[PDB]
Amino acid sequence: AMAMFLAVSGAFAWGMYQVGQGNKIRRALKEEKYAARRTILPILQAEEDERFVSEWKKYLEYEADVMKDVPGWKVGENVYNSGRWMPPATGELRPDVW
């Protein structure tokens, strides 16, 4: 008939409006979740830095002892001519996925 078209087309409008209004709330909730992560990142990063520097001290102490005899060595020489610090590479091309 004709009322069927009216009710279906009004449902398609009001329901899409409600879908948008709920997507707004979902976005607000997700933004709150993200904002709760950017306030605790420094302490986690600080702990990671302390652990990494301790382990790096251990690794340099290890490498200095093993090849003290070799004439040509530097013990922890940066491989980058620029001088930038980069994380030690690993033999895994995607470690943080498993």
Partner: peptide, 9 residues
């Protein structure tokens, strides 16, 4: 560099 940010951490 982690060794250059221990004071702030």
């Amino acid at each position: 560099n982690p060794e250059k940010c221990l004071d702030k951490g």
